Design an enzyme around this catalytic site. Structure first.
Site: not given
Ligand SMILES: CC(C)(C)n1[nH+]c(-c2ccc(Cl)cc2)c2c(N)ncnc21
Length: 271
Positions: A28, A24, A134
């Site tokens: 990685e 992203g 999250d």
């Protein structure tokens, strides 16, 4: 402690990166081996994409949260490119694993077992005075034995006094975030409990997106009327009533993670 006295620094030569599993904007994630024989996950920072100090804060948090139910920090390489080396979870993300042929064949009994493992991990987090912020199926990793561990501690925070208030421009996934956190930037362990309620819907629907057929504005509007997510298809009513406890309007009325673990184990030991 300085890296030379640190129990976590490790020469980069000890590692062999074998398979990129993800990539992203900030780096990685690879499957690799430590000293030839030990399988590990390696998250590498894309230089310049973000602060090296911000990247390492995740590792520093993992140092304070060690438990069998949380993905374990193994080491760090603090010179560029910066690496965070952790326990390797063979079946990867729960949200992805539930969609594979093995996940699809899981009985409600085993899904309840997993839900309880997650509540168990969150009860340790709750006891240490931390919050995660999250909590969602994407952030639960699955082992080769189908045991689950909490992961992605990047937003985790030690709660000094009762609550952590994010920065005014901070944005969070609306469908998994408690109203008090969305409306006020206010997070407590009770916000994680709300998220856990949402995570249970992901489990029972084998990874479907919460609030099927609704945009974020619709979810907000429905919540403000006092409605909660429609009962997912094939969801046992006992489990749905447990999710409703997680979605109590007042944070203080929502149950503890220990209560949740205990009820979930009973549900499992019955089915
Ligand atoms: C993204 C995915 C599912 C490829 N992934 N991400 C991590 C991971 C590794 C290091 C850190 Cl610091 C945080 C998470 C991970 C892991 N340990 N094991 C298996 N898959 C993993």
């Amino acid at each position: 402690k300085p890296w030379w006295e640190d129990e976590w620094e490790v020469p980069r030569e000890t590692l062999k990166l074998v398979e990129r599993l993800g990539a992203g904007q900030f780096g990685e994630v690879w499957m690799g081996y430590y000293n030839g024989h030990t399988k590990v996950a390696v998250k590498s920072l894309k230089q310049g994409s973000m602060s090296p100090d911000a990247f390492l804060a995740e590792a520093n948090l993992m140092k304070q949260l060690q438990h069998q139910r949380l993905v374990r920090l193994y080491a760090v390489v603090t010179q560029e490119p910066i690496y965070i080396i952790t326990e390797y979870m063979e079946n990867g993300s729960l949200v992805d694993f539930l969609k594979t042929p093995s996940g699809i064949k899981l009985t409600i009994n085993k899904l309840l077992d997993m839900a309880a493992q997650i509540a168990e991990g969150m009860a340790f987090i709750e006891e240490r005075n931390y919050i995660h912020r999250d909590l969602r199926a994407a952030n639960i990793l699955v082992s080769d034995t189908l045991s689950c561990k909490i992961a992605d501690f990047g937003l985790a925070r030690l709660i000094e006094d009762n609550e952590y208030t994010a920065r005014e421009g901070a944005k969070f996934p609306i469908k998994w975030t408690a109203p008090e956190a969305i409306n006020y930037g206010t997070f407590t362990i009770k916000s994680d409990v709300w998220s856990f309620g949402i995570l249970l819907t992901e489990i029972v629907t084998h990874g479907r997106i919460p609030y099927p057929g609704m945009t974020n504005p619709e979810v907000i509007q429905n919540l403000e009327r006092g409605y909660r997510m429609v009962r997912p298809d094939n969801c046992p009513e006992e489990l749905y009533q447990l999710m409703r406890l997680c979605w109590k309007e007042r944070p203080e009325d929502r149950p503890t993670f220990d209560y949740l673990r205990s009820v979930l184990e009973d549900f499992f030991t019955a089915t």
